[PDB]
Structure formats: structure tokens, C-alpha cells
């Protein structure tokens, strides 16, 4: 049962500059590999699912993952003021990732991907940094597994 | 206690605001914003930023925010603000300008919202883009002068 990696469609798969924070470590800027795929559940091809994988490349192939069923999306959508439907969601995330990829140090507003790892969870956000403040454009929670 | 008699008014003009309350339709109204910097009547070495919201139609529709230099630290931290107290008002004004200039076909589209709930209100300026609505600034206001 569950997400069928077998027939999933990958929409985006490449490195993205990320500003990482752990409690007991120095801040780091790392290119992390981001992958966004849509698919369906094996036991029911009618269940639509979105999956996002974040990872540092290593021979462990170890991932942090987020999985959002179309059902989960209803709640996620309302908690973040998201205005698009489930099908359009990945594309909106991808556009934000592209701005992070494009961003250069003098930009203003500047787009930046940020990751904070605490306990068994990572919180990923894409923020804009402007002459006034930093503010989030999207926030996503990830988990190992 | 804010000392009006020695305050500098930085901004005093109308701003289109979406006024929200739970038991009535939203109302889009030009509300008058006065932004002033000054010091406490009880202490003329305590700098204070005051923002006063009023209506030309209702002389008793009144909402006020006063932020001392020390209160600003907590505000600055909570909201990822990257400027000092002296620069704070100017950034608020830039955001208010975006709301004043906003056009129906903008994307992102800026909008001023005031949500009134009992003896408290929340003022925020949000952007509405093709993906979501997200706040640029959020500020707690009290009823009266």
C-alpha cells in the first residue's frame, strides 16, 4: 500500500542552495537535492499524493521527506493561506525554488531557502529578505523515513 | 502617555483598508492613518512610535498602537525585522504606499487589513500573489486614542 514510487511523476529534481541551522552546529550553506513528485496510492489509483524529498547526497541515500495526500492538502491549504488547487500546488513550490536558485547576494527582495533541523524533524521554508525584514513565502515540515 | 505636543508627524493620510468583523460583511474603507514619533509625557528620554487609525465618517472609530524603543526589540525579533527603531516607521510607510497604489490586476497585490475582535484589533499588510496570501507586517492595536 501507500505511495507508488513506481509510477510517480517527478516534476523537479536538482540541487538548491539552502541555509541550514542545527542547534549544536555552525550555520552552513549547502546545495541540497530537492525532488518533487506526484503519484497515487498503490491500493487505490484514485488517491492523489504529493511527495517532496530533501537530501544531502551520500552513499547512504538518506532522505528527509514530506508526503501530502489530496486530503491532507485541505488543511495544509487553510493553515497557510494557499489559493491554488492540489494540482497546481507543486508548480507554485517549484517557482519559489527557482527564485532561490537564481538569487544573488545584492538582490532585494532576495529569495532564500532555509532549513532548521530540531529533534526528529526538519522545518523547511523559503523566505524573502528585503530592506525591512525576513518573511516566509512557504513553510513545510519534513521527517526522516 | 504619549506627548503629542512635541511629536513629529511622519505620515497623515487615507489608506484603503479592508475592515473585518465576524458578524458583518467586510467593508473596504479609506481609513486615516497618522504616524508620529515622540517621547513619553512621563519620560522625555523614552522614544515612542505612535500609529493612530481614524475615520472621517465616524469620529469615535479609533485604534491606536504605541511602541516604545524597548517594546520594539520583542516586535523586531517576533517578526524577523532587520532595521532599527528609527527606520521602522519608514518601512511601515513604504508598505502603506503599496496598499494605496494597489490595483485590481496586481500580482503580487498588496492589501491593508484591520480585523476587529472585542477590545482588540490586528492590523496587517498582506501580499496576495498567484500562490497564496502572506503577511508583510502584523501589528496589535487597541481601541481609543
Numbering used by the authors:
A (entry chain B): 14 to 158
B (entry chain A): 15 to 159
Original authors' sentences:
Here, we demonstrate that the centriolar protein SAS-6 forms rod-shaped homodimers that interact through their N-terminal domains to form oligomers. Proteins of the SAS-6 family comprise an N-terminal domain with the evolutionarily conserved PISA motif, followed by a segment with a predicted coiled coil and a less-conserved C-terminal region predicted to be disordered. Furthermore and in conclusion, because these residues are well conserved among SAS-6 orthologs, we propose that the self-assembly of SAS-6 homodimers into a 9-fold symmetric ring structure is a fundamental property at the root of the universal 9-fold symmetry of centrioles.
By contrast, we were able to produce soluble recombinant proteins from C. reinhardtii Bld12p (Nakazawa et al., 2007), which has the same domain organization as other SAS-6 orthologues. Like for C. elegans SAS-6, we started by producing a fragment encompassing the N-terminal domain (denoted crN) and solved its structure to 2.1 Å resolution by X-ray crystallography. We found that the asymmetric unit of the crystal contained three equivalent crN dimers (denoted the crN-dimer hereafter). The monomers in each dimer are related by local 2-fold symmetry. The overall structure and organization of the crN-dimer, as well as the F145 residue engaged at the N-N interface and corresponding to I154 of C. elegans SAS-6, are similar to that of the C. elegans ceN-dimer. The stability of the crN-dimer in solution was assessed by ITC, and the Kd was determined to be 60 ± 20 μM, which is similar to that of the ceN-dimer from C. elegans. Overall, these results indicate that there is strong structural conservation among N-terminal domains of SAS-6 proteins across evolution. In addition, they demonstrate that the function of the critical residue within the β6-β7 loop mediating the interaction between pairs of N-terminal domains is likewise conserved. Having the structures of both the crN-dimer and the crCC-dimer of Bld12p allowed us to build a structural model of higher-order oligomers using both dimer interfaces. Strikingly, when crCC-dimers were associated such that their N-terminal domains interact as observed in the crN-dimer, we obtained a ring with a 9-fold symmetry (see Experimental Procedures for full description of the modeling).
